[PDB]
Design a protein around this motif. Sequence first.
Motif, PDB file in Angstrom:
ATOM      1  N   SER A   1     -30.247  50.616 -38.933  1.00 38.87           N
ATOM      2  CA  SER A   1     -31.289  49.844 -39.633  1.00 38.87           C
ATOM      3  C   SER A   1     -32.484  50.780 -39.778  1.00 38.87           C
ATOM      4  CB  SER A   1     -31.586  48.529 -38.966  1.00 38.87           C
ATOM      5  OG  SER A   1     -31.697  48.688 -37.581  1.00 38.87           O
TER       6      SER A   1
ATOM      7  N   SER B   1     -24.998  43.378 -43.066  1.00 41.53           N
ATOM      8  CA  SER B   1     -25.018  44.521 -44.036  1.00 41.53           C
ATOM      9  C   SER B   1     -25.157  43.957 -45.448  1.00 41.53           C
ATOM     10  CB  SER B   1     -23.755  45.357 -43.915  1.00 41.53           C
ATOM     11  OG  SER B   1     -23.743  46.488 -44.801  1.00 41.53           O
TER      12      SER B   1
ATOM     13  N   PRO C   1     -24.494  50.172 -40.580  1.00 42.61           N
ATOM     14  CA  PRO C   1     -25.215  51.460 -40.498  1.00 42.61           C
ATOM     15  C   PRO C   1     -26.468  51.218 -39.660  1.00 42.61           C
ATOM     16  CG  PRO C   1     -25.964  50.331 -42.364  1.00 42.61           C
ATOM     17  CD  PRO C   1     -24.933  49.411 -41.748  1.00 42.61           C
TER      18      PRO C   1
ATOM     19  N   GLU D   1     -31.177  53.406 -48.683  1.00 40.89           N
ATOM     20  CA  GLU D   1     -32.495  52.756 -48.520  1.00 40.89           C
ATOM     21  C   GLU D   1     -33.700  53.686 -48.447  1.00 40.89           C
ATOM     22  OE1 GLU D   1     -33.512  50.456 -49.638  1.00 40.89           O
ATOM     23  OE2 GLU D   1     -33.091  48.600 -48.589  1.00 40.89           O
ATOM     24  N   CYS D   2     -34.583  53.654 -49.423  1.00 39.79           N
ATOM     25  CA  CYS D   2     -35.793  54.415 -49.677  1.00 39.79           C
ATOM     26  C   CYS D   2     -35.743  55.824 -49.015  1.00 39.79           C
ATOM     27  CB  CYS D   2     -37.159  53.839 -49.395  1.00 39.79           C
ATOM     28  SG  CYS D   2     -37.581  52.104 -49.427  1.00 39.79           S
TER      29      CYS D   2
ATOM     30  N   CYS E   1     -37.427  46.971 -47.631  1.00 39.13           N
ATOM     31  CA  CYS E   1     -37.427  48.322 -48.016  1.00 39.13           C
ATOM     32  C   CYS E   1     -36.515  48.592 -49.236  1.00 39.13           C
ATOM     33  CB  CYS E   1     -37.096  49.371 -46.948  1.00 39.13           C
ATOM     34  SG  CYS E   1     -36.876  50.972 -47.850  1.00 39.13           S
ATOM     35  N   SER E   2     -37.161  49.077 -50.263  1.00 37.43           N
ATOM     36  CA  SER E   2     -36.661  49.472 -51.572  1.00 37.43           C
ATOM     37  C   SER E   2     -35.567  50.540 -51.589  1.00 37.43           C
ATOM     38  CB  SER E   2     -37.878  50.017 -52.357  1.00 37.43           C
ATOM     39  OG  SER E   2     -38.877  50.394 -51.406  1.00 37.43           O
TER      40      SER E   2
ATOM     41  N   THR F   1     -30.109  47.221 -29.528  1.00 37.28           N
ATOM     42  CA  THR F   1     -30.157  47.577 -30.923  1.00 37.28           C
ATOM     43  C   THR F   1     -29.714  46.254 -31.592  1.00 37.28           C
ATOM     44  OG1 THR F   1     -29.504  49.806 -30.260  1.00 37.28           O
ATOM     45  CG2 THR F   1     -29.715  49.507 -32.644  1.00 37.28           C
ATOM     46  N   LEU F   2     -30.617  45.705 -32.369  1.00 35.49           N
ATOM     47  CA  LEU F   2     -30.316  44.442 -33.040  1.00 35.49           C
ATOM     48  C   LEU F   2     -29.897  44.794 -34.445  1.00 35.49           C
ATOM     49  CD1 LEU F   2     -30.201  41.489 -33.275  1.00 35.49           C
ATOM     50  CD2 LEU F   2     -32.637  41.347 -32.907  1.00 35.49           C
ATOM     51  N   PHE F   3     -28.936  44.102 -35.053  1.00 37.65           N
ATOM     52  CA  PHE F   3     -28.602  44.498 -36.459  1.00 37.65           C
ATOM     53  C   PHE F   3     -28.408  43.223 -37.321  1.00 37.65           C
ATOM     54  CE2 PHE F   3     -26.494  49.000 -36.013  1.00 37.65           C
ATOM     55  CZ  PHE F   3     -26.262  48.953 -34.663  1.00 37.65           C
ATOM     56  N   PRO F   4     -28.980  43.415 -38.492  1.00 44.31           N
ATOM     57  CA  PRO F   4     -28.936  42.399 -39.552  1.00 44.31           C
ATOM     58  C   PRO F   4     -27.663  42.630 -40.399  1.00 44.31           C
ATOM     59  CG  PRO F   4     -30.140  44.282 -40.374  1.00 44.31           C
ATOM     60  CD  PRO F   4     -29.727  44.619 -38.949  1.00 44.31           C
TER      61      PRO F   4
ATOM     62  N   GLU G   1     -36.047  50.211 -38.815  1.00 40.00           N
ATOM     63  CA  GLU G   1     -36.869  50.274 -37.612  1.00 40.00           C
ATOM     64  C   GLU G   1     -36.052  50.946 -36.527  1.00 40.00           C
ATOM     65  OE1 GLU G   1     -35.164  48.228 -38.971  1.00 40.00           O
ATOM     66  OE2 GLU G   1     -35.600  46.155 -38.366  1.00 40.00           O
ATOM     67  N   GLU G   2     -34.996  51.619 -36.895  1.00 42.20           N
ATOM     68  CA  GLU G   2     -34.189  52.308 -35.854  1.00 42.20           C
ATOM     69  C   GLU G   2     -34.218  53.769 -36.309  1.00 42.20           C
ATOM     70  OE1 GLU G   2     -29.925  52.492 -34.861  1.00 42.20           O
ATOM     71  OE2 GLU G   2     -30.503  52.556 -32.798  1.00 42.20           O
TER      72      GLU G   2
END
Lengths: 216, 216
Positions: A125, B125, A123, A214-215, B215-216, B120-123, A127-128
């Motif tokens: 992020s 999931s 999905p 997410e929040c 982020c919560s 677009t960098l993604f971490p 900061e996007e």
Amino acid sequence: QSVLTQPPSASGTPGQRVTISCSGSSSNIGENSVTWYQHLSGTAPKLLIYEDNSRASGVSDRFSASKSGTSASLAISGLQPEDETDYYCAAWDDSLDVAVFGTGTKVTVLGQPKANPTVTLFPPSSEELQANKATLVCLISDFYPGAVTVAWKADGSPVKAGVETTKPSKQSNNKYAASSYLSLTPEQWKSHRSYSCQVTHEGSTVEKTVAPTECS
Amino acid sequence: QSVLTQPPSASGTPGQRVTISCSGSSSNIGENSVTWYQHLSGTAPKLLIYEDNSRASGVSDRFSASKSGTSASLAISGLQPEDETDYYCAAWDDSLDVAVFGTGTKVTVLGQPKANPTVTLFPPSSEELQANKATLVCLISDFYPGAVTVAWKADGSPVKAGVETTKPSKQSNNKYAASSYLSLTPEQWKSHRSYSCQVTHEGSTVEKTVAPTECS
């Protein structure tokens, strides 16, 4: 639009007998004459098989076609390397009354263990989303042969528009890799319950789902 | 191939005006309606105009057609860089008792503008980590021309090992897209402070960064 369905890939070992099938309807395939082509990137839709059953010229005795209901099949009987190309089927649609096309099949002279895709969906992020943009990615890797079909659904109704799909490329492992992405509006994204990607590969049809968390 | 006579090529520049011609006989063009298709090497033709003059759904106003007498003309007004594909006419043939297909025309957009790639960098999931697995994706879209150089950095150093980068493919807007990924242990992931993706498109460079969670 609405096309004639064909597998992404078909293939087998050298000499082997392979057959690319193509399914339509009542108004096209099963009422009109399926025509078959050989395509490949660099201007060349070479017609192969006209009037269903009949072979073009310079057309190897190797190819022949058929037609059951709302279905047709091209069988290359004696797989040679010269075959690994894209194959397309087409029929007239007297309902739309326009020429309806197949989605294409790639025949690979299977030089290695078939491998299914590893579908990993992501999905947008923060900061996007924080940047007012939201893009999803369906990493598709470790697969062979290198041809997949990707579909995206947004709430079960499938999204057609905005989906971009890379063209497979042999990874470092000799296996293939591809990505497909969808560009949404952060609202457009947080305005659906689920987002699924769907890759189909020689027989196997994996599928992933995602949903905003997410929040919020 | 060869049957409904089209100019083999047409050239332009963003904003000109181009007109693809389409010449038949009385039994096809003369007597039935002309249909036009757009083709993107490796896609499957999408219907562009039907009933000589009407646009399939989702077709720009840039496109208009006409059946002059025995010939038809498709015209691209205000030519764009995503207009660069092949174009086909079709018509039913009264006598032959079959659909006749045009020989094809391919447009060229003389000098598309440089476009710098969107990174677009993604971490990993949560749900890919929910099964002890972490992949990182640098998507790199809507760039022109097509050559890029990607580079990974784990805490400002070149975490160059376990990284696959796609070879750039031309999307739906004749603008490239490529994507690279890094595959590491969920540990190996969390084992850093910063993971950055670096893209050098033509002497330029955008670098995007990602930090493990928040982020919560």
